Amino acid sequence: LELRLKSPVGAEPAVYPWPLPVYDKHHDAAHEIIETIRWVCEEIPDLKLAMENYVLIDYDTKSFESMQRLCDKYNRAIDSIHQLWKGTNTRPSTGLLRHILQQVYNHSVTDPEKLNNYEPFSPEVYGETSFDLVAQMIDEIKMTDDDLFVDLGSGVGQVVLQVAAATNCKHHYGVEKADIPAKYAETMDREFRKWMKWYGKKHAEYTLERGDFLSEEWRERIANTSVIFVNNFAFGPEVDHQLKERFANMKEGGRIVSSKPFAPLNFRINSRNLSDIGTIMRVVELSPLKSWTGKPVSYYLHTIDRTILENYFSSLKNP
Numbered sequence: 001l002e003l004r005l006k007s008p009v010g011a012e013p014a015v016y017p018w019p020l021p022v023y024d025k026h027h028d029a030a031h032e033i034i035e036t037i038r039w040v041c042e043e044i045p046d047l048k049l050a051m052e053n054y055v056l057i058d059y060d061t062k063s064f065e066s067m068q069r070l071c072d073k074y075n076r077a078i079d080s081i082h083q084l085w086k087g088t089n090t091r092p093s094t095g096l097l098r099h100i101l102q103q104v105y106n107h108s109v110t111d112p113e114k115l116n117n118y119e120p121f122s123p124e125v126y127g128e129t130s131f132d133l134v135a136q137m138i139d140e141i142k143m144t145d146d147d148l149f150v151d152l153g154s155g156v157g158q159v160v161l162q163v164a165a166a167t168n169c170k171h172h173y174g175v176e177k178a179d180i181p182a183k184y185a186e187t188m189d190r191e192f193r194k195w196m197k198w199y200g201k202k203h204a205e206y207t208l209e210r211g212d213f214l215s216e217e218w219r220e221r222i223a224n225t226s227v228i229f230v231n232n233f234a235f236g237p238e239v240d241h242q243l244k245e246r247f248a249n250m251k252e253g254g255r256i257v258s259s260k261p262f263a264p265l266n267f268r269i270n271s272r273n274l275s276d277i278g279t280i281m282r283v284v285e286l287s288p289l290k291s292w293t294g295k296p297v298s299y300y301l302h303t304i305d306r307t308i309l310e311n312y313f314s315s316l317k318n319p
């Protein structure tokens with residue numbers, strides 16, 4: 001007893017056991033199958049033409065025979081389109097990527113209780129809460145092939161997967177210290193590469209790794225990163241102090257996007273604060289509110305600029 005979905009690009013079929021897994025209070029594998037078919041039909045207009053109209057309206061998720069018939073209609077339509085193409089690798093759309101990440105998460109995180117997350121943002125609600133904000137952050141910073149991206153404390157790795165599917169950075173890294181999310185990230189990585197292949201979608205190179213971003217190895221790695229993403233909201237003063245020290249080695253124009261600012265937005269350099277990280281970085285509050293309909297969130301863009309410190313010395317020497 002199983003259900004199979006043929007890949008639109010000839011990759012290995014997606015195979016689901018029956019009874020289908022139940023993901024959470026609202027989602028299940030049955031709806032993932034239906035939504036997957038709907039996304040492939042949107043992607044391939046010829047595919048939408050070949051299928052019978054009722055198939056994606058008249059279905060019973062609690063019936064094996066009904067789910068099997070739905071899968072068979074999609075599979076036969078895929079076969080017809082593959083025959084049509086016989087006779088004569090792009091980036092995913094935002095909507096498809098949200099679906100892919102959800103699919104990757106549900107196939108990877110089978111024990112939801114394991115991830116100690118009673119916070120307003122948690123991996124299980126990534127698509128609902130966080131996805132649109134990360135999509136807004138990606139649009140704002142405009143990364144190129146010259147950039148190296150690092151998410152410090154990447155958890156299960158969804159921010160890294162999203163940025164990698166959207167930009168052309170040389171490489172994207174996710175570093176996670178905690179055992180439970182770092183182990184889940186290994187499955188997330190495998191499931192992401194697999195599903196992206198299944199849809200025939202392109203992503204940049206990325207690595208999800210286990211490690212402490214405050215270690216000696218990571219000092220030089222942070223120094224050579226051009227774009228850092230860091231959710232520092234829950235960080236203690238010591239971690240925050242250690243991080244500012246890592247940032248002090250970054251190159252001019254290096255950028256840090258965080259959930260809480262590392263320096264005051266109105267920092268004014270003087271003789272008593274020359275030690276502060278504000279002496280070497282611009283800070284701006286960015287908000288999706290400035291057609292947004294999500295939570296009234298803000299994020300902070302820090303840019304390495306030692307001319308702040310240089311101008312203060314110039315103004316002292318040349319009044």
Ligand SMILES: O=C(Cn1nnnc1-c1ccccc1Cl)NNC(=O)Nc1ccc2ccn(-c3ccccc3Cl)c2c1
Nearest residue numbers: 121122123130153154155157158159229230231258259299
């Ligand atoms: O565990 C994860 C990603 N991940 N993967 N699956 N779920 C999550 C997740 C889990 C808990 C909380 C938030 C998230 Cl996204 N660490 N990486 C991460 O947080 N990067 C990040 C970096 C910079 C900013 C600036 C604003 N934010 C932000 C702050 C609050 C809410 C959303 C966003 Cl995107 C940021 C988020």
Ligand SMILES: [K+]
Nearest residue numbers: 049051052053
């Ligand atoms: K039709």
